[PDB]
A paper describes a structure:
Escherichia coli NleB1, Citrobacter rodentium NleB, and Salmonella enterica SseK1/3 type III effectors fatally glycosyltransfer N-acetyl glucosamine (GlcNAc) from UDP-GlcNAc to arginine residues of death domain-containing proteins that regulate host inflammation, intra-bacterial proteins, and themselves, whose post-translational modification disrupts host immune functions and prolongs bacterial viability inside host cells. All NleB/SseK orthologs have a typical GT-A conformation with two abutting β/α/β Rossmann domains unlike a GT-B consisting of facing each other β/α/β Rossmann domains with a flexible linkage and share a high degree of structural similarity. Several structural cores were revealed for the new arginine N-glycosylation systems: a catalytic DxD motif to position the Mn2+ cofactor and UDP-GlcNAc donor substrate, His-Glu-Asn (HEN) motif to select UDP-GlcNAc as a suitable donor substrate before other sugar donors such as UDP-Glc/Gal, C-terminal loop to stably embrace the UDP-GlcNAc donor substrate, and Helix-Loop-Helix (HLH) domain predicted to select the acceptor targets. The SseK1 effector GlcNAcylates Arg9, Arg190, Arg160, and Arg149 of four proteins involved in methylglyoxal detoxification, namely, GloA, GloB, GloC, and YajL, respectively, and catalyze methylglyoxal detoxification to significantly enhance their activity.
In all apo- and UDP-bound NleB1/SseK1/SseK3 effectors, the DxD motifs lie in the 219YLDADM224/221YLDADM226/224YLDADM229 regions and their quaternary DADM motifs form a Type-I-turn by H-bonding between the backbone CO(i) and NH(i + 3) groups, while the free Asp oxygen (Oδ of Asp221/Asp223/Asp/226) in the DxD motif interacts with the hydroxyl oxygen (Oη of Tyr219/Tyr221/Tyr224), named as a YD bond. In particular, apo NleB1/SseK1/SseK3 effectors have the free oxygen Oδ of the first catalytic aspartate in the DxD motif, ready to catch Mn2+ and UDP-GlcNAc. All N-glycosylated NleB/SseKs form a Type-I-turn in the DxD motif in the ligand-bound state, and the pathogenic NleB1/SseK1/3 toxins also retain Type-I-turn in the DxD motif in the apo state. Apo Clostridium toxin TcnA and apo E. coli NleB2 have twice intertwined Asx-β-turns, where Type-I-turns H-bond between the backbone CO of D284/D218 and the backbone NH of F287/M221, and the Asx-turn C10 H-bonds between the side chain of D284/D218 and NH of D286/D220 in apo TcnA/NleB2. These results indicate that the first catalytic aspartate in Apo TcdA/B, TcsL, SseK1/3, and NleB1 DxD motifs is open to bind Mn2+, whereas those of Apo TcnA, SseK2, and NleB2 are tightly tied by the second aspartate backbone in the Asx-turn of the DxD motif and are unable to bind Mn2+ and their ligand.
Numbering used by the authors: 23 to 209, 212 to 300, 302 to 325
The structure:
């Protein structure tokens, strides 16, 4: 509304920006084994203990005035893409966005460039503090680089773990509201380009309402027995190319084998706020996404 509000971390004040009740939601489904689903089924796991499509449909049915993205990748059968088109037709606020249809080149770097800056960073490293093996592996990987394969973004399309989904999610979230604009799925703003990423296990039990996040970014924090950690389930951004995620992308461009979750999000947010030596815990209550309307499918 009319007046900007502030919060303090480490004695510095920071602007709270306001994600209105129209801010889009983004879910993600990157599927290794489309063959597990019926040939004309929605290819998202939907079982009583894992009701992920139901969670997404619930969010869409609760937040009628929000766009609901499903950012998808994997070799889907053509009748599963047909199922996805039917979902968009059934629920007019659900918008399916294929990774394949989005250009991520503006966030790319040559593997050769990352490898060689790391070599130079080590080889020039004052003493033998050098990781002998990292130096050795870097020089060999620099050698086995195919012509149209010198891409940090293409490399994550061959990632064998969580890195395939988490790297692309970070870049989807660098695009934020502009993701819907890029996919021609808007029915938005040149300013109001915020977005809230939610993991498909999160359940909106009722209407989110307006949300205040600090300096335009907030993350899932989990607490177990009084210890807090930042988590990848919830990322809320004030706009596209939010500086914290660019900080995270900068680490992904410099640190060889950087983790897209702990470097691409956590470390990036950390650098943006210049944290480090203070309490992780006090930082975690600061950066935490406040909702109270998003439980997981493991609660009573």
């Amino acid at each position: 509304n009319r007046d900007i509000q502030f919060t303090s971390f480490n004695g510095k004040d920071y602007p709270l920006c306001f994600l209105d009740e129209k801010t889009p939601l983004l879910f993600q489904w990157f599927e290794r084994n489309p063959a597990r689903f019926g040939k004309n089924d929605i290819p998202i796991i939907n079982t009583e203990k894992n009701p992920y499509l139901n969670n997404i449909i619930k969010a869409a049915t609760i937040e009628k005035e929000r766009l609901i993205g499903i950012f998808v990748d994997g070799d889907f059968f053509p009748g599963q893409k047909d199922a996805f088109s039917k979902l968009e037709y059934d629920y007019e606020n659900i918008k399916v966005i294929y990774r394949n249809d989005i250009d991520f080149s503006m966030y790319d770097k040559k593997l050769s460039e990352i490898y060689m800056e790391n070599i130079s960073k080590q080889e020039s490293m004052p003493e033998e503090k050098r990781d002998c093996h990292l130096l050795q592996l870097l020089k060999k990987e620099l050698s086995d680089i195919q012509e149209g394969n010198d891409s940090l973004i293409k490399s994550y399309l061959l990632d064998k773990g969580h890195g395939w989904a988490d790297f692309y999610r970070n870049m989807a979230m660098l695009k934020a509201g502009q993701l819907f604009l890029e996919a021609d799925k808007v029915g938005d703003l040149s300013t109001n380009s915020g977005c809230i990423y939610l993991d498909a296990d999160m359940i909106i039990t009722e209407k989110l309402g307006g949300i205040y996040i600090p300096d335009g970014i907030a993350v899932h924090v989990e607490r177990i027995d009084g210890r807090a950690s930042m988590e990848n389930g919830i990322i809320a951004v004030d706009r596209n190319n939010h500086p914290a995620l660019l900080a995270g992308l900068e680490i992904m461009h410099t640190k060889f084998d950087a983790d897209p979750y702990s470097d691409g999000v956590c470390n990036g947010i950390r650098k943006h706020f210049n944290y480090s030596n203070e309490d992780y815990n006090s930082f975690c209550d600061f950066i935490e996404f406040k909702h109270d309307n998003i439980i997981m499918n493991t609660s009573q």
